[PDB]
Design an enzyme around this catalytic site. Structure first.
Site, mmCIF file in Angstrom:
data_model
loop_
_atom_site.group_PDB
_atom_site.id
_atom_site.type_symbol
_atom_site.label_atom_id
_atom_site.label_comp_id
_atom_site.label_asym_id
_atom_site.label_seq_id
_atom_site.Cartn_x
_atom_site.Cartn_y
_atom_site.Cartn_z
ATOM 1 N N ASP A 31 25.803 54.044 -11.051
ATOM 2 C CA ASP A 31 25.549 54.308 -9.542
ATOM 3 C C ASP A 31 26.594 54.923 -8.812
ATOM 4 O O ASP A 31 27.754 54.307 -8.607
ATOM 5 C CB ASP A 31 25.410 52.696 -9.001
ATOM 6 C CG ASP A 31 25.435 52.617 -7.620
ATOM 7 O OD1 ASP A 31 25.643 51.565 -7.289
ATOM 8 O OD2 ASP A 31 24.839 53.702 -6.864
ATOM 9 N N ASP A 219 23.287 59.076 -3.731
ATOM 10 C CA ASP A 219 23.499 58.043 -4.446
ATOM 11 C C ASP A 219 22.318 57.830 -5.434
ATOM 12 O O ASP A 219 21.231 57.995 -5.552
ATOM 13 C CB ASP A 219 23.065 56.821 -3.542
ATOM 14 C CG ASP A 219 23.333 55.351 -3.851
ATOM 15 O OD1 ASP A 219 22.846 54.439 -3.261
ATOM 16 O OD2 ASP A 219 23.723 55.331 -5.040
HETATM 17 C C1 LIG Z 1 22.479 50.102 -9.108
HETATM 18 C C2 LIG Z 1 23.052 49.346 -8.124
HETATM 19 C C3 LIG Z 1 22.621 49.935 -6.673
HETATM 20 N N1 LIG Z 1 23.512 50.869 -6.235
HETATM 21 C C4 LIG Z 1 23.598 51.102 -4.845
HETATM 22 N N2 LIG Z 1 24.398 52.168 -4.577
HETATM 23 N N3 LIG Z 1 22.459 50.985 -4.104
HETATM 24 C C5 LIG Z 1 21.645 50.153 -4.527
HETATM 25 N N4 LIG Z 1 20.246 49.761 -3.675
HETATM 26 C C6 LIG Z 1 21.530 49.552 -5.807
HETATM 27 C C7 LIG Z 1 20.560 48.624 -6.296
HETATM 28 C C8 LIG Z 1 20.556 47.200 -6.171
HETATM 29 C C9 LIG Z 1 19.375 46.431 -6.961
HETATM 30 C C10 LIG Z 1 18.377 47.084 -7.505
HETATM 31 C C11 LIG Z 1 18.487 48.467 -7.275
HETATM 32 C C12 LIG Z 1 19.352 49.268 -6.775
HETATM 33 N N5 LIG Z 1 17.239 49.509 -7.683
HETATM 34 C C13 LIG Z 1 16.876 50.779 -8.049
HETATM 35 C C14 LIG Z 1 17.623 51.284 -9.452
HETATM 36 C C15 LIG Z 1 18.052 52.776 -9.081
HETATM 37 O O1 LIG Z 1 17.927 53.248 -10.534
HETATM 38 C C16 LIG Z 1 18.557 54.697 -10.388
HETATM 39 C C17 LIG Z 1 15.869 48.580 -8.211
HETATM 40 O O2 LIG Z 1 14.956 49.110 -8.662
HETATM 41 C C18 LIG Z 1 16.059 47.043 -8.155
HETATM 42 C C19 LIG Z 1 15.425 45.983 -9.182
HETATM 43 C C20 LIG Z 1 14.953 46.574 -6.879
HETATM 44 O O3 LIG Z 1 17.162 46.456 -7.617
#
Ligand SMILES: CCc1nc(N)nc(N)c1-c1ccc2c(c1)N(CCCOC)C(=O)C(C)(C)O2
Ligand SMILES: *[C@@H]1O[C@H](CO)[C@@H](O)[C@H](O)[C@H]1NC(C)=O
EC number: 3.4.23.15
Length: 333
Positions: A31, A219
């Site tokens: 990330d 991002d």
């Molecule tokens: C990574 C961590 C992360 N980093 C950033 N900068 N933004 C986010 N929204 C997330 C973040 C948190 C929870 C998540 C997801 C992302 N994602 C997207 C994954 C993106 O993969 C490239 C999901 O699908 C579910 C399970 C809802 O839970």
């Protein structure tokens, strides 16, 4: 080094990393939208069902473990996790580095029960690191082994036949195998954040958005392309999309006709086609089809800003340059 990523429904991209001795494996999203590393902890109450469904790091089985216990909380746009800090050796595709990471003891069901991944490896700058923890990329650089101070992202399009890599991250450069043309760089507004100046967003032939300029966070840890609730409302109005609870839809039979959407970055238009932003799962006029573009208001200091996630990176191979504080895009091959 390069790490092979797995693509889950075009919304989750993650790779493998090993922590401790012997290595305890974990699936993690790399990330660029955060700066900490974290994985579910064995100290996580099983009352948190999400901890029952993921790999949990157990310090008790690691001979190289290093205690710290400093509490921390990681806030993402779609969820929060709590835990404490720990140190151990982390294996990232060939490179081995001693790293401070978070052992999460609080993993809320929504959304983590829906995560195919276990944790997160933050590729952001230390400036955004919660608890002032040295970021894993900084630590890798410290070893002076990477041919260059950069890392690249390739996010492939989903595939019904596991045999095609879902994506790949390269530490120290870019893989020419997954992009054509030349990179077009854009200088970072400010070091400390993978954010750049966006000169405009257009829907069809008429720049109806982000006039006068706006911000774009690149991002890799976000599933979509997002903008302030105001912006999207305007954008989606033009596409004729209906606003739902968490997403915007359009009648599937209308998906293919939707107009192009462009982003003015560093003096080059980055155009997405309907096929690029709509989850065309049907052509039926009796079914709704989701858009890979959402409304998401990022709070200061980072926001208000647009976010260029997987919907964008799927089409444009992305290189993150720490050495020159710039982001590079190229047509993904
Ligand atoms: C990574 C961590 C992360 N980093 C950033 N900068 N933004 C986010 N929204 C997330 C973040 C948190 C929870 C998540 C997801 C992302 N994602 C997207 C994954 C993106 O993969 C490239 C999901 O699908 C579910 C399970 C809802 O839970
Ligand atoms: C955790 O690591 C930080 C980083 O230097 C250190 O300052 C802190 O004292 C450590 N916590 C403990 C008590 O192990």
């Amino acid at each position: 080094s390069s790490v092979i990523l797995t693509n889950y429904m075009d919304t989750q991209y993650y790779g493998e990393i090993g922590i401790g001795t012997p290595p305890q494996t974990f699936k993690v999203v790399f990330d660029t939208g955060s700066s900490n590393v974290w994985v579910p902890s064995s100290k996580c109450s099983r009352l948190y069902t999400a901890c029952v469904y993921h790999k949990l790091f157990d310090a008790s089985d690691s001979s190289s473990y290093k205690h710290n216990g400093t509490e921390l909380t990681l806030r993402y746009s779609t969820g929060t996790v709590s835990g404490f800090l720990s140190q151990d050796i982390i294996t990232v595709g060939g490179i081995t580095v001693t790293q401070m990471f978070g052992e999460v003891t609080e993993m809320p069901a929504l959304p983590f029960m829906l995560a195919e991944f276990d944790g997160v490896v933050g590729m952001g700058f230390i400036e955004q690191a919660i608890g002032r923890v040295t970021p894993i990329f900084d630590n890798i650089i410290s070893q002076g082994v990477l041919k260059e101070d950069v890392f690249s992202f390739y996010y492939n399009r989903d595939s019904e036949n596991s045999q095609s890599l879902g994506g790949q991250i390269v530490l120290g450069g870019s893989d020419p195998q997954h992009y054509e043309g030349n990179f077009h760089y854009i200088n970072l507004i400010k070091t400390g954040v993978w954010q750049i100046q966006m000169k405009g967003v257009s829907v069809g032939s008429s720049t109806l958005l982000c006039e006068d300029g706006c911000l774009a966070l690149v991002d890799t840890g976000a599933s979509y392309i997002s903008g302030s609730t105001s912006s999207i409302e305007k954008l989606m109005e033009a596409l004729g999309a209906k606003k739902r609870l968490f997403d915007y839809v359009v009648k599937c039979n209308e998906g293919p006709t939707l107009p192009d959407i462009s982003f003015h970055l560093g003096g080059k238009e980055y155009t997405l086609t309907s096929a690029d932003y709509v989850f065309q799962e049907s052509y039926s006029s009796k079914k709704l089809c989701t858009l890979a573009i959402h409304a998401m208001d990022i709070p200061p200091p980072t926001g208000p800003t647009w976010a260029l996630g997987a919907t964008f990176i799927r089409k444009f191979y992305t290189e993150f340059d720490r050495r020159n504080n710039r982001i590079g895009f190229a047509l993904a091959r």
